[PDB]
Symmetry: C3
Subunit: 438 residues, 3 copies
């Protein structure tokens, strides 16, 4: 049940009713492909051509794995975030696979089965998968060599996966995300998730959202040694599930004076996704880092700040004494809209045409200067200047919470007009300094 | 006919002569694939293997469509933009396809033809396409079952499109962009555009720029129901065509005093693409959101601000009284270049080596400290410090408009040196306050 | 030998021991595919179907090349960078290939061989490659037409490369990066690099890092004329190799007073990669633009500033008189971590739980309020609030350099709390102004 409240006083809107799925950790599995260490007619020539693609793929992956895997790591409020190393857990597992005897343990565990748990030498208990046995196919079906065309067809089919895995790694420098169906087919991933040491709620959540799991996973090319090709697939652990989440939408709140350039603006800067988490609130300032599936929101705690739950008071009383609510100030009174979950915020200033329309009937509301809001019931589009926005047509109730725009409480003569990483208190602090000198 | 003017007074350059193609709206088409609801030798075994890939693909897409489609939406002057919901129109059409009887209308309309217009239950008139009839192939060619190898080959060819469509959706969570040739082949797209309810100028523009149309389109996986696979392809509507566009390039303008750290800088912040549109100017602050093809510039109005055409006065008189031109200030006198359409802006400060070269002859100009410009006639590269820039070799005339750098009109002692979202008036406003106290 | 030093005084850490590979220029090669200008049974029907895919691909590429190739160009300290035109060199070479007689020279040079150097009409000496002769296959093997199935199989294999090259160009508007194995196979690229007019150190570096070369290259679709398909592959020139590089990591340094909101913060803004280069330092403010492979760091000089080597003094004495070290100030005392090459910086403020753990033993350190650091020896994870960071497990020694946090030297009453593009001197300059008025 999605709902939404718009706050006329602060030109912001909160969408409630979502359930969390937060990636809090990683699980590393080792996916393996067993390799073969190895007068012409037309059908044998096609076999030699496909066999050469196989050798080249192996040679290509071996040349690729002469270097340690790595990505590119750093050194509205997104600049406040820290800097992780996303594949550091997978790379550490991959580093263990280079120790002597380590690959042999995996090779031995997968001798009689395709699915095995192996505890590596450093105590890490990883699930191991043999997804393709090219050794057994090439040795039992191609080493006999003249032959037939159904072997040519079948060999192209079994080799194609190796060639595609190699292509993906070649244009991604050994590290891919999302994890394609060549790295792990849909059935392999589902059975991997089923055999995973996770709870029953996590298995259902991951199985019902495999496409999201793929986007939150990495495939890390690891080693080719002793006829074994191994890459680490690093899967999300969802350690926070089904807690309340809400999306804060903000838009500029300006005065609407007639004289151009005499207008002052403020904007709440704490927009993003918010999820209750372990007694605090996980705040994701760049809401584009989260993916929404029905009422479930998938985020990654690496792109979050951990905040006191009092941050929610900015939505009811931005002047509350318990949390210093974050705002920016400006003079730029430019018009724009923010499409919310259940409606649209319109910040209409100057001489801009701002309307809301219905498909069949056309314009049904003309906005006046200021910040205003329309629900998605009976509305299909919104227009701000030359920009047409379609609104979301999801079901749910909106509440318009009336209140005076807080920008009216500020005297333009002492208003600090270029504050970015600011708050209610910092702006009051600067006002009182300009007031002292006059 | 592309032309360019450089303004020495403000360290900026405008490239004129371009024609617009602005995505103002969306058109939603429903693309359908008709599905089949269904002792071994070598050729039959290959058929069973390909048939299993088909079942798995269907099963995979069905598991994928258990959730509502969505992307990731937000909550130099790009921070001023609003926030749309790019696939909200497609998702709304897709939501209608889940109503009872809706899929049946599409199935019936496409019974005797592959191209049909269907008015959905909510009055939306959508064009509908059947691009692949796997039902008829599997039922009339594979249900008879021993057989031959040309059936194995042909079935792999017809099934491959379904498998690739499924792969794309699987690593993109049901929403792809650009729209690949598997979603819609080049011929299907061209005939879709031809049968579209659009003007003749729009049909020619889209047909001559299909690769751009692909990049501005989305494919939204929708429903598998009653042996019909349907995905919505959401195509751009170019409601603004052939209006004048120009690209504003800006670069830092600093004083060139000898004492390090005594220099003050300003930079015009209104760089981006500008297109005349419906009596105003559509401003795209993140010029990387537009794609240039010859003299045609393709943009998306969702990444624009609608501005008074008086904003063009900042290029002739930055101190004009009709528009408050946007600038930032700093002390960071770092060297850099901006490659323009027809030349290069060089901001050379401190001890940096800045030159312009020709392929055959080498260095032909050494820049002195300040902001300067060179046309692309006779120039192939520009070097600022350890950075080599190739210049664009497109044809067209540049004009160097002489004038005193406006940074010279500012007294460094009262110059506000960390203004970002500022303007000419805001900076004068702050100067007069620091002047009052001294 | 990677090493790291943490500076408690400034909440920053430097990772030393890396070797550079800086793309300083571009090399343009012309890759060519020779084209053919051209009652049914089952095997001939499959041949006609594959032949139609071939015609459509040619027709598609011809329609694509009716426009000039282009990308999307612009107009912590990344905003200081200039703006290049990445494919301007390739596009210029491609423009020459449209002059009359130019394609014929290439066609003639590659008549008896697949590898040739051709000097174009404007004096550019480009290496030219014929990677696929579909003309000779279609004319000598398919123009004879009933036939066999091994021809159907072989023709699908030889045509597939053309179809995939066409797909890539179709969803990328004629410009791809990275350069896939369809544009240039691994062997073709290696032999291209070997025949390149570059030094022996550059050949080894590029050959041992082809996957990185691919990511730093572009493929530019160019011309279809006189049965020749030509695209320009634009390869990086690494003109700076094996100079020292180091990564600067920064994190917020705040006071740790008990009263909420009374804390002041500063953060060094000069984080990024740094490489010695030609007497200066190449600074890459967006460290995600560089790719690390073992101890080699690959960057692109287009995303760099050229700085005096004195910028390194900010790591030893941020108050040094030779370079004005860049900082930002704020009041936002939010907790976060920065994962470094060999450890983790923890900025722990307020009521946040901050710990460091080992896989087997659990929590081994609890951080107190302030900025602190832990090496990756014996540490596997770090937790700041609800965010778990895995640390990098690479080998190397860390040094903890003790010193008083410089934030303690600032009186909060005159501390400028919203400076972004600031420096040590600018902040002192503002403090002395607020001090004068009190
Ligand atoms: C890329 C970039 C470059 C330069 C820069 O500053 C910023 C940060 N920044 C500031 N900074 C403020 C400005 C005035 N302040 C002066 C105190 N009266 C100083 C620091 N205002 C901003 C606004 C409004 C929008 C987006 C970013 C903003 N980002
Ligand atoms: Ni829209
Ligand atoms: Ni360049
Ligand atoms: Ni991590």
């Amino acid at each position: 049940n999605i709902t939404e409240e718009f706050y006329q006083s602060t030109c912001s809107a909160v969408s409630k009713g979502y359930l969390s799925a937060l990636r809090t950790g990683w699980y590393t599995s080792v996916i393996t492909i067993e390799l073969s260490n190895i007068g012409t007619d037309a059908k044998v020539k096609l076999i030699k051509q496909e066999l050469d693609k196989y050798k080249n793929a192996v040679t290509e992956l071996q040349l690729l794995m002469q270097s340690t895997p790595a990505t590119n790591n750093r050194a509205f409020l997104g600049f406040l975030l820290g800097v992780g190393s996303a594949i550091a857990s997978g790379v550490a597992v991959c580093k263990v696979l280079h120790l002597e005897g380590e690959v042999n343990k995996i090779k031995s565990a997968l001798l009689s089965t395709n699915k095995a748990v192996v505890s590596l030498s450093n105590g890490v208990s990883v699930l191991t998968f043999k997804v393709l046995d090219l050794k057994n196919y090439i040795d039992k079906q191609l080493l006999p060599i003249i032959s037939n065309i159904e072997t040519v067809i079948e060999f192209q089919q079994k080799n194609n996966r190796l060639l595609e895995i190699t292509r993906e790694f070649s244009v991604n420098a050994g590290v891919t995300t999302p994890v394609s169906t060549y790295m792990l087919t849909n059935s392999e991933l589902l059975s991997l998730i089923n055999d995973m040491p996770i709870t029953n709620d996590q298995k259902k959540l991951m199985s019902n959202n495999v496409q999201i799991v793929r986007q939150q996973s990495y495939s890390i090319m690891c080693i080719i040694k002793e006829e074994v090709l191994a890459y680490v697939v690093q899967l999300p652990l969802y350690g926070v599930i089904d807690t309340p989440c809400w999306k804060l939408h903000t838009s500029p709140l300006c005065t609407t004076n007639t004289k151009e350039g005499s207008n002052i603006c403020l904007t709440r800067t704490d927009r993003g996704w918010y999820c209750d988490n372990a007694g605090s609130v996980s705040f994701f300032p760049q809401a584009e880092t989260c993916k929404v599936q029905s009422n479930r929101v998938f985020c990654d705690t690496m792109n979050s700040l951990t905040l006191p739950s009092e941050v929610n008071l900015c939505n009811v009383d931005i002047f509350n004494p318990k949390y210093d609510c974050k705002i920016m100030t400006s003079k730029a009174d430019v018009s724009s809209s923010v499409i919310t979950s259940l409606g649209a915020i319109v910040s209409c200033y100057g001489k801009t045409k701002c309307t809301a329309s219905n498909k069949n009937r056309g314009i049904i509301k003309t906005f006046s200067n200021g910040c205003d809001y329309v629900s998605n019931k009976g509305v299909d589009t919104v227009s701000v200047g030359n920009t047409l926005y379609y609104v979301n047509k999801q079901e749910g109730k909106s509440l318009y919470v009336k209140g005076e725009p807080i920008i009216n409480f500020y005297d333009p003569l002492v208003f600090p007009s270029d504050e970015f990483d600011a708050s209610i208190s910092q702006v009051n602090e600067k006002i009182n300094q300009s007031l002292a000198f006059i």
